[PDB]
Amino acid sequence: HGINNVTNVWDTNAGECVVMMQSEFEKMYDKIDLTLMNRLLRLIVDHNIADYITAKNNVVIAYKDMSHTNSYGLIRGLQFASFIIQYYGLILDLLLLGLTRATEIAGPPQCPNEFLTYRDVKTETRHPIRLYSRYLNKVHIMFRFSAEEAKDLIQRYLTEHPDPNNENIVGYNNKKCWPRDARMRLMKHDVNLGRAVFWDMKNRLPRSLTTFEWDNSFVSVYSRDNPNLLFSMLGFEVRILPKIRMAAESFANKDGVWALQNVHTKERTAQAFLRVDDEGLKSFENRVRQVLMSSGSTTFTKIANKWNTALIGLMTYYREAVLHTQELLDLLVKCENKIQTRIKIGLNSKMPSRFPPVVFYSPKEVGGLGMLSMGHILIPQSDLRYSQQTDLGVTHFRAGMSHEEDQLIPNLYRYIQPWESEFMDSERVWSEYALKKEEAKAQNRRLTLDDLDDSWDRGIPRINTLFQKDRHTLAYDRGWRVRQEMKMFQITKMNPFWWTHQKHDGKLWNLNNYRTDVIQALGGVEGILEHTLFKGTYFPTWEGLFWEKASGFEESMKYKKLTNAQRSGLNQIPNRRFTLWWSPTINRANVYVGFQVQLDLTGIFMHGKIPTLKISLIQIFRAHLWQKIHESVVMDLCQVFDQELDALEIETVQKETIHPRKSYKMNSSCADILLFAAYKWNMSKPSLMADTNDVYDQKPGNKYWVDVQLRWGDYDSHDIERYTRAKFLDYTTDNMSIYPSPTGVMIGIDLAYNLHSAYGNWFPGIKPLVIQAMAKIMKSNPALYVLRERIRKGLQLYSSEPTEPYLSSQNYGELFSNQTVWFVDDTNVGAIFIFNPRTGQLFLKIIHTSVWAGQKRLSQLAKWKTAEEVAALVRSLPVEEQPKRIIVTRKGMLDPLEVHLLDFPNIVITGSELQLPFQAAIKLEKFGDLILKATEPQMVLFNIYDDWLKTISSYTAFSRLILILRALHVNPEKARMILRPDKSIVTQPHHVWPSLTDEQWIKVEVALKDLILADYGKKNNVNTQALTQSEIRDIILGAE
Amino acid sequence: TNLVNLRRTIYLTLMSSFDFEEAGHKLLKIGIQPGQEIELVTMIIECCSQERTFKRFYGLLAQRFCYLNRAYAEQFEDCFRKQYAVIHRLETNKLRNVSCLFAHLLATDALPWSSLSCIMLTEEETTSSSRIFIKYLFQELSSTMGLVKLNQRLNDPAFSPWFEGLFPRDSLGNMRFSINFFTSIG
């Protein structure tokens, strides 16, 4: 816009030529003399500051064993380096301009004139140098010459560099990045005006300080025979074509082409065509290369967030210049693919359709990586042979990045407002704000928030930043934009947004519409979750569901207890959640290639080698859970046939037990629920359970067959009806299949997608009955339940549903009721624990070390064996002695025993917030000696009620053993002296405690409670005198 | 809801593409059936108006579609008249977007000038948003073609009756309101 506004800039009538030179000061920082710098700084700052600034540059630079003293350059990593650079460069600007052209470009000290403007046109036109800027070490100058001025210059140049042969044009630098007509030509007057103004400005600079180099410079002449003025300023290639000159065809159309208005005439006199430099594209590509060259083992999500920051920097900097840079569009396609396949390679599965667009581009909210995209755009490329000649326009284009269907991932451009529009909008909103305050501040109805929401993300400082927490202490932040530029010489991370700063600029972009449009373009959050292991968590809605970040258990536990022996072991967890969650799409059946191994004991087929997926799915169907789900569903359909045991003409069908390896016999099936039924009832022909109609012909006796076999559907085959109909239609037809009735009717279940169906010969009073049965089965079973919870733990998908009340203090009476209540402490395995409050007995089953001769994991095997031994007690117990509630102390045992209590699915399993000192139970001399004295596994029946509860209550002796357990946990070498007051104060050998009378018993329990309270207060800096009833009782029993 | 599904397709096409070339080509291969072509063009306007300001994408793809088939051209002109009918309810940002797009296409002969009859210039007939959008489109086309260019094109006898309302001669009150208003424009 300043190039446009220099008077008669585009006139080439009288031979006037416009030159646009740009060059850097070639070793500007390297060559700052610290003595001259010191002297010049003393001109603008206190001599003490000058001397500090000068001394700070004279330092030793060390690398490893290398070291030298800096005597000559400037240290660029200094914090005030930018100020030295800008003042020194100002001195070089005065060298280039002279103190008259500088004082005209700058304007009077009292009324300085704005960036590229002058006070008059007599002042503007006096001198060839029209427009001038220096961006730190890079200079842009626009001269306009008379043909007399241009001629004198070219003369002096050639008379200084005489070459008769006409070898002038050979080594000239004008960019090939533009089309061949539109670049600067090879005229002699133009090539020579270029070189002559370069040479004449390069003579202006003492070569001891700096020069200009022709190879790191660029001149462009706009003359008679050259219509366009070119430059490249920051990453932008700019080609300005005026109307007067070689347009000849009135052109105002493209998104990335800026229309240059005159400030006076207001006519669009030119167009600026923007590309991105080949330096800009190399910068971005190197930046992606650097992301891709990372810690080597990073999460998919940091690879994706670093791609996202790289892409946002690129697109939000260059915005519309990206448009007409086609090498950028190809670079972006190639580089977004690169990021994706690094992520894929993170799973050893480079296959599409394992990782469809949904996996990468779905928000982090919906478990996806959240990648933004600029690659799914057709790449417009026109006929090669002619395209560089005339800017022909595009006839063909190529498919940028592949989709899954006629899918389309929203392009990130359309959510970034163009820079031209941003600057027009800003002109408007800030001009109107100027008039609004200029009008209201005297009117005393001064501007306020929501006087402005016609402009809230608007203005190039957003009209969002006047209403800021710090707008008082950001009026003092000057030079912050240089500051941010210069931070590359101080830190080794390169900020992609070095050019902007929110406290001053505002946010300047918003990509929320992008995430909602990407959800809509993926088919909405439902069509996204179709690819996910959700619908296998049985969370009824996606809505009330939130993801774990796990950033609550990174710092909260430890500072240095994490090791490199455990580092990647932790960076694998968030890829495990991601892999488990997309396994419907990752481990899908229509894969191109992959050997399709069936998992160890399950009915899951892995097509290929996804190791993380197999480990997840292998610790989800642990403990033969595929067998158990089949057992439970067939068992309970037979029990629905003990439920309707007489209404229809049937017999007792009890739990048909058969070969256990049948659920996962994925080719052939047999021997589901018992057939036996008294009389004859009239079957259908093979229809789907979906309908209800068609009860029909012949009905054979005691030949009433159903087969329920499970499945793990993929995204691309989870259609349960087709699968069940096919399974029936297949191996009822086949000979390998033992079906006692010619009506071996099939029921399918999708364990992954939680669906159900059936297809076959319906024996009347079934479809409304089996439909009922299944619709209640798929919500109720202990087996399906422990599935859904294993999956929920793997995904770390939690609802605000979390289960019934824990063992919290408000329930200390509920254990004393008529139901047999059970406790367990699976830390001390070793030996397992069972704490029965109602009876005072203990099931101290001691575990021998031979059950750990060579067993894979100590903790894992011990936790499962503890549940299995609880199950072995529940087995070798009568039915009248079995429990109903089983409170577990350590939360890890909630998993296994719930599976072990599927055969007794009546017993309640729940956690406990309360802590008990069963650890202190092994601090007793008997527990500390005898268990380690035992040679072999043995059950030790016990009694915490040595002689107590004969008269004392259950809760009363519990409130006694509470302080007993606490003073044994803490005091133990103090609780000895209470329980060892005298040699003659005796005990019984067949009980653990020495029993006294009630007065001495109470005095000793008061001492035992004092031991806990006076020992908690001194470690808690807490007085023992203001302790409340609960403030004592919550510490004495357990943990609050 | 299949019209909602086509608005899905056409929106999703626009938001998923880079240049007006790509958006247009993809749209035209979606198989837009005649009679419902306007369903795209309004979406071609709507999203463009929702954009924080002018991405020339809209005027570009539209002025490429107009000479591609003048059906969409007449549809754009008639929808411009309908927008003149209801611009009273328009927020100023979507207003400026729609107006600048229509003027940018105007300076480039992608629509007939006849559609410009929808401008009356009476103060009882001009609400605030009316004259505001008018000043916007006028400065836009006076930029896109030029001061002398517009002063030449608009004074033409072949353009005379189509500037009937915008330059009223029946009342000098209308003449004065037009003169003062347009002067306040630039």
Partner: peptide, 26 residues
């Protein structure tokens, strides 16, 4: 066909290598 346009090899660039004709050409 390949009437002088674009990639000669669709291997190391990151697209499937299809060149559609502009339905927007005049």
């Amino acid at each position: 066909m390949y009437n002088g346009i674009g990639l000669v090899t669709p291997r190391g660039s990151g697209t499937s290598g299809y060149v559609q004709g502009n339905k927007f050409n005049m």
